[PDB]
Amino acid sequence: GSHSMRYFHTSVSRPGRGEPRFITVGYVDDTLFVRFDSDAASPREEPRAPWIEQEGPEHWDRETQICKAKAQTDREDLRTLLRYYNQSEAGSHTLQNMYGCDVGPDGRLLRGYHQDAYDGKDYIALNEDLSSWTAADTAAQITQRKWEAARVAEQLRAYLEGECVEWLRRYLENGKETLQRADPPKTHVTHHPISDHEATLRCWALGFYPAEITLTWQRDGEDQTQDTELVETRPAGDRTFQKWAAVVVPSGEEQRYTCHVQHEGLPKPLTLRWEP
Amino acid sequence: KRWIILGLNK
Amino acid sequence: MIQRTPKIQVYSRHPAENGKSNFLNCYVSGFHPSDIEVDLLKNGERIEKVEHSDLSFSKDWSFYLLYYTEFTPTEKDEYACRVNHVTLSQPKIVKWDRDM
Ligand SMILES: [Mg+2]
């Protein structure tokens, strides 16, 4: 199937409570493989998956150095952005960055990403062309000007089309046992009477990997998108995910409803109904 | 593998 | 600034079976800023051995964390997740419903 590699970074200032806390994590699809926390006992790029443990200490030293340089750049940038937004130095602020690449089943680049947010709002983002920027406001246009002067986009494009795709390919091979295994959902429908004249049908999906899934309810073969309650896909803690979709139905019409399940571990979409 | 850059200040 | 209150789900790793070892999960998500206080409760009291996932965030920049503990459910024992965040005036308590 298709795969993704992403690095996530969060810096949170805490005036009066020391320097900003920095946490970064790396993922291949929905598997975390590295983490670095500035407030850990021994901050380092820590391998979190068996398949990455083979890279060796020199690799971890290099990755650790990159993490520490980014924590330092973020401390400088949190001060800069107080100036750009004319803010008090007293408040807590957050800087986030995500970057990475998506590849198709042939390992070819589908899309590259590099984007930043300040206080949870878009700040500056590399466009899909990997050559232009979307600056959210006039402060981010100052950064855009610096980055267009330093030819940042060109350097990013070369990483995203090169090392990003090559290393994701290497990790997918080294971790093929897990990264390249899709665990289909275990599915069932439960029934819960609401009143004398209505009941809830809840379609469950458990134990699936990756997280991407579609659960839909049809009434007489028509999608019930507007009337379906969908919970956010949630982690089980054993690598797998869970999700449910529910509909409120007139009592006695249960067999007119069908739950449809799409997941990459399924060879074909699955159809299920309330059985008893 | 992380991306390494200099001059990335905002 | 504009902030986002956490969404909360309380559930078990596997379908609950009284007397069988399982994991109690509290998934907090969609919140901003990242600082949050999460407790897992057994009959209203704070469980001590509670671990949590590494701070990460979604496409829309909001944060998410999984808090979890190993437990053996029973018919009598009631579990809950208690969450505090800057968007909440008081801790929010979500009960564990084995059918949600
Ligand atoms: Mg509060």
- A151 exposed, middle or buried (CB, 10 Å; 0-12, 13-18, 19+)? exposed
> Touching check for A66 and chain B: CB below 8 Å?
yes
Domain count, chain C: 1
Distance in angstroms (rounded) separating the CA atoms of residues A106 and A227: 39
CA distance A8 to chain C (A): 7
Distance in angstroms (rounded) separating the CA atoms of residues C45 and B2: 43
Q: Give backbone dihedrals phi and psi of A144, rounded to 5 degrees, phi first.
A: -55, -50
Which residue type, as a one-letter code, is found at position A79? R
User: Where exactly does CATH 3.30.500.10 map onto chain A?
Assistant: 1-181
Q: How far is CA C98 from the centre of its chain?
A: 14
Contact A10 C57 (CB under 8 A): yes
Q: Which residues surround ligand 1, an ion (CB under 5 A)?
A: C 84, 88
Q: Write the CATH number of the domain with boundaries A1-181.
A: 3.30.500.10
Q: Count contacts between A and C (CB, < 8 Å).
A: 70
Tell me the Ramachandran region of residue A200: left when phi exceeds 0, alpha when psi lies from -120 to 50, beta otherwise: beta
* Structural domain boundaries enclosing C74: 1-100
CATH code where residue C40 lies: 2.60.40.10
Could you list the beta-strand ranges (E) of A38-185: 46-47, 94-103, 109-118, 121-126, 133-135
- Chain A residues in contact with B5 by the CB 8 A cut-off are 152, 155-156
> Touching check for A81 and chain B: CB below 8 Å?
yes
By what method was this entry solved?
Answer: X-ray
- Chain C residues in contact with A35 by the CB 8 A cut-off are 54
Contact C35 A96 (CB under 8 A): no
Q: Give backbone dihedrals phi and psi of A234, rounded to 5 degrees, phi first.
A: -125, 145
Find the closest chain A residue to C7 by CA distance. Answer: A232
Which residue type, as a one-letter code, is found at position A189? V
Cα C37 to ligand 1 centre (Å)? 9
Distance in angstroms (rounded) separating the CA atoms of residues A59 and A65: 10
Which residue type, as a one-letter code, is found at position A259? C
| Contact predicate A8/A25, CB 8 Å | yes
Which chains are adjacent to chain B, needing at least 3 Cβ pairs under 8 Å? A
Fold of A182-276: Immunoglobulin-like (2.60.40)
User: Which residue from C13, C24, C48, B2 is spatially nearest to A7, judged by alpha carbons?
Assistant: B2
Contact C61 A37 (CB under 8 A): no
